[PDB]
Symmetry: C5
């Protein structure tokens, strides 16, 4: 038998196969299993509120027609150039921007057909998908990003979408993200869609992302701690009143302010207050306190600037110094560890 | 009856249905009801003067042809591949940039037809639409953005566009905007269009947006208040003449100026003066006053630098200090609350 | 009579209408009237040297064919789907980048035909057009932007382009630009094109744009004036030699320099010197003078630092102070008003 | 004779003209003359390493077929809608990115045919072309940008490309570039291409660009000179040891550093050292020297701070001052003029 | 024999050549040799994690059909307009974004056919390819970028891809990269692909890139060294306690911090610590030490500020100075050379 003759008999003019009619017309809904392979992941930006993903969609369904039973083999790998004639289920993504195809040299498509009629359709598509991330806790946070596959034009009575029991989602080996660590959980559940026009099927896939704090710690926490320690020692040995003494505080003020402004750049605008803002606010309070104590001791010195009074004022000023000395490391220590442990337990609960 | 035979009889060669002729030719204008569903909203930028929206257009009209009365069911869900043969009303948007279609796997289209001839056309389109926002009051403002649907090629005698009496505009559940809060009002009115060529139908939909001031307050108001308070206390204990005393003022000057420059970055250029500019101007006036009073007390000290004269100059200088002390918090307090209450009442009127 | 039968008789196979032949072949040139409507304007950027415009092109010409005289009405509104068969005049823009079409739901096109043969073609196109603006005077300037319509493929003997006597250019009501004010003058003149291949027709439309200086004044002139006044008073009460006195000058130097650098950011690079540069240069000269006078009085004090000599040096130093006092406001006043009046008269002449 | 009948006889089914066969098959190579007109030029960016150009390609060749000799006129201006049937020579650009066509209203194309068979093909194309500029001397430099036209698919035995003897390259009148001045030289030479597959024809066009230094001088040279002069005078009158004296140097240090960082922004990264870097380095050396001399005189003063020794130390310190005084202007003068004259002669040689 | 008649006999209707069937059907897999020519390279950005490349793909395979043996010559250069009829092997790239074709004037394609049936297919394509660079050592690093060619739709039994024994990869003469130096090694190995659907052939090409450190050294190392030396000398002659002395340290602090922030701008965010960070950290430690020693000597002076005690405190303070003097150059010298030699040996091993 020649291949061409059979090939036109299967889906051509002698065949009564109209490509505008669903298989099993006036019958039970056509069940469709969907298997997705993630070729690549990444390019997630906080401002844009979306990520980039390259998938290999694969969907299988059954047809009562296109059952040959004439060649001795089980399956046939057909050309992807008559895919227009074969009926194709509609499938679009709800949180989707763009989503072009790939056409390098030839269109990237795959067609297979078995003896019973089970087909295999494979399409490569790069999707920009919108993820509504919540930045309540900026340095440490778990982000859930949603992929939705749903039927635009058919009701419940047709095109029921089902997941695959085994190996529903696969990932490429040695695939890494610079910023996040992917979690191998990938919980799958499906939520149907209700509209005034009708009720439409949908299936959902969920991915969990964990950020890496190493960059954040080196970029912000480590310099800020250095500034705090520097300020502490600078006043600790500072003596009486000198214009030079003021310089140590002045440098810290400006540098801390610039760092604070710099940190709130990449992130988009949100009403709620992030954790990094809290850390910046407390460090600003500490540096603001530094000036305060100086003003205080200067006021005591001003009152001092008779012999009977001098001893008490000089003593009171020194008392202010030693009390500042013991107080400043202690309250920062009891606060930062409290901050870290409370964030440590919230991530553990999440 | 086979589905294919009926399907070609309805809109094919045996049918006298020419797709270039409007239904009810030489007759009353074809009425069209339009229902819009907002799939997603967002990506509004002040500079660009436009926003991004993903809608689900739905338009219904009646045809005297395409009335089958042969299958026992009421409606038929047809394929979206013969939509070219069906006559389609022209519809374009006036404040429109771009507005591509979506073609993921298959074109996103929907076709339905009832027994009487009422059709249902559904198209997914992402529109970039221009909104002429007025920034007279920057931190608090209500913005109205306009969507216009109008007929490019037909006159009044044809293609009259009407709204839908019930559920004209729907919104997706759990849809949020990072910057703005959408108001559930959505007032609908229609304005016809007049041209030299003729008079063309149009319908309009209006959306109200309310900005969230939480980001603005934390970003700008809170640091500026801190700078003002710091400056106040800094001079409050400042004593006589020392080069060190000057430092407190110097830091504030530069930091305030940098913040003022930084704030006017995101916004585009406009002739009128924004509220934030007013707040920045008054704070700059306060810090400018700080230097002034110093210069004054230094001039009194310069005159002082004989015994009879010294008491009066020293007293006058101290008088200047205490008067500065009582005056500075009081006038800022009576001004900021006045500013807030006047803006509070203008938003209430708006 | 059926509409379809007439519709194919007019421009089909029974008709000898070849769409590759110009009307009035071997005859006088085909005159074409062009009417343009500006749907929207804006998005002008100085660096890119171009603007964005959305027009409604409309062109009318006569054909000896397509004269029906069979239906009792005067005109017919045809579908825009047989516009390919109708002969269309070539028309392109010389200072053009891009210029895509609009295809939302359906192509935006319009076809009309009268009894005599006068047709009406309407096309919506968004054009990015290059405007060679001259920035000799930056804050105040009038910019002329050119739109050119010309025939790519035909000579003088064919396709003569003429303007419309009445209402050649219309503008949408309530159309505004954030930066510029449009002038309702719109002078129209036409310049033919000469090439080695031949002579080609062209028509030109000119628009005048006037910038709004309110943003510029608030952004730059008002802070710079404040810095100048501050500097003036700061030295005015400055006494003898103190390291603190220097601070007043130091702050001004840096802030003025940063503002000067900031101002020359948006503008692209040009050889000639802008007006804003002149204003920045004079203010820099004033602040530079401030340091000078200080150095001078310090040199007199250094010579002073015997009793007979002290009186003359102290007097000379005070003389320098009072002379500085009277001189500094006077020369700035006689210069700034001179600057403003000369620019006021140049705009009036322009 | 009707135009349509002749028009289909020339390139249709009765004609044996196959559009897949080169003219003069099994014969001498088809010679092609190429004339280029530069409609616009500009948009050159140093980082991207490419420029934007809008050309009017024009190529002429001879065909033995398509020789009519039946109409009494010499040439015919055909429609650009049967250009697909006419055989067209392949032509692509080697240093090419993008290069789309223009389709405003109608495709921009031109067809002409003479009695002998000489055709004229005109195509409008905007090309982004890569120019490998060498930035050895940044402020003054001559840049050569290359345009290459070559045959992708044919060997030497076919499609020989020749230039045009007269008026090979034309430029539009009144065409200017904001940054560069075009030179009216435009030397043309051709270099053939060798590959493993075969030898392919190519022709090359060269353009020379001269930068304008006016922006660079005002932006960088003039402020830097002002800073140098200021520093010079500031120390020149500086007296003994005062903390205030230090301020004059401190301001210069920071401002010079910021300017130095600012200048190296637009330019991309290169291994070799630019001229502007040299100028920045020498000015940094001068300001660095300023601090040095201060440290020296302070060390002499420190040793001074017995009567016999005081006279010699005070004298030595004053000697250091006067020597600094004479030395500093002289060495800057003998260096800057040397720098300018050596660059003046290198541009003259180039 | 006419060329047209043979041309349609080879791949037309009289020929039984179906373009949907692979050559050697039901036979051994079709071997394909692939030769790639790199027309241009460059535009590599660290953030995007990808590079731009313009290649000339060339693939050869054998067909049992299309064996003419009728013209006396060996090969024929066909038109690229019947390339659709010829069967073409599928080929796509795995680490691929975009990859459009080039269509300037005509499509860039090449067709050749020999007497035996060996064909030659040439396609020009610009590919954006993702390179997973590792920035463990930023200033000096070798980067490997991967190109993968693989068969989308066929299994092992068909379309085996083989490399070319001689001249597999060629590069254009005089091709340079501004940032990197290409290594003439280009090791080629192939790795097959395993999927649930089946096993698919692939081949890989590897390129090695070496960065040039000249820009980095001038941009960062040279200024930082200057700051370190300046700081060293500044304290080296600094005397006792003066507010002026503090200035030398203050300037360094701010400038070093700004440089440190500036350096970490171009690079994207990564968890691990780069070499440049280490160098910045050590320089920050040195400048931080500068303040420390000052505080120490000031504390000794404070204790000093009775005659018996004064000699020991003054001596101890001077001892601190001389010890600082000998210590500071020595430890920087023993550290920087150690840093350079360890990086020198790691690059040599790599
Ligand atoms: C799809 O599956 C459901 C439940 O398993 C079944 O009731 C229905 O008949 C199936 N439809 C088919 C096989 O077309
Ligand atoms: C549309 O509605 C108007 C007013 O209800 C009516 O006069 C007109 O006949 C309608 N046109 C139709 C039904 O085609
Ligand atoms: C166009 O107008 C000119 C001048 O009015 C006239 O000479 C010419 O015949 C006209 N061409 C037509 C009507 O085709
Ligand atoms: C092209 O020119 C060359 C040299 O002038 C000549 O030998 C060749 O025959 C020409 N080819 C033609 C006219 O086809
Ligand atoms: C391809 O090469 C392999 C090994 O050289 C060989 O076994 C196979 O038959 C070849 N396939 C062909 C020539 O189609």
């Amino acid at each position: 038998m020649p291949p061409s003759e059979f090939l036109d008999k299967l889906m051509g003019k002698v065949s009564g196969y109209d490509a505008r009619i669903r298989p099993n017309f006036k019958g039970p809904p056509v069940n469709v299993t969907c298997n997705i392979f993630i070729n690549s992941f990444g390019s997630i930006a906080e401002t844009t509120m979306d990520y980039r993903v390259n998938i290999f969609l694969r969907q299988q369904w059954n047809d009562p027609r296109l059952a040959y039973s004439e060649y001795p083999d089980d399956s046939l790998d057909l050309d992807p150039s008559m895919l227009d004639s074969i009926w194709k289920p509609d499938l679009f993504f709800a949180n989707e921007k763009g989503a072009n195809f790939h056409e390098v040299t030839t269109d990237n498509k795959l067609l297979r057909i078995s003896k019973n009629g089970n087909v295999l359709y494979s399409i490569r598509i790069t999707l920009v998908l919108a993820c509504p991330m919540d930045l309540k806790n900026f340095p440490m946070d778990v982000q859930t990003c949603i992929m939705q596959l749903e039927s635009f034009g058919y009701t419940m009575n047709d095109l029921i979408f089902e997941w695959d029991e085994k190996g529903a989602v696969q990932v490429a080996d040695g695939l890494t993200l610079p910023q996040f660590i992917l979690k191998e959980e990938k919980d799958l559940r499906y939520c149907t869609k209700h509209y005034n026009t009708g009720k439409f099927t949908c299936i959902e896939a969920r991915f969990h992302l964990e950020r890496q704090m190493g960059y954040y710690l080196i970029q912000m926490y480590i310099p800020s701690l250095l500034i705090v320690i520097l300020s502490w020692v600078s006043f600790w040995i500072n003596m009486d009143a000198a214009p030079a003494r003021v310089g140590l505080g002045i440098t810290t003020v400006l540098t801390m302010t610039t760092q604070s402004s710099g940190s709130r750049a990449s992130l988009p605008k949100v009403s709620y207050v992030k954790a990094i803002d809290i850390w910046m606010a407390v460090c600003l309070l500490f540096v603001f306190s530094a000036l305060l104590e100086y003003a205080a001791v200067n006021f005591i010195a001003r009152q001092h600037k008779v012999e009977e009074m001098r001893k008490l004022f000089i003593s009171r000023a020194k008392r202010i110094d030693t009390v500042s000395r013991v107080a400043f490391p202690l309250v920062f220590l009891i606060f930062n560890i409290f901050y870290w442990i409370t964030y440590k337990i919230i991530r553990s609960e999440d």
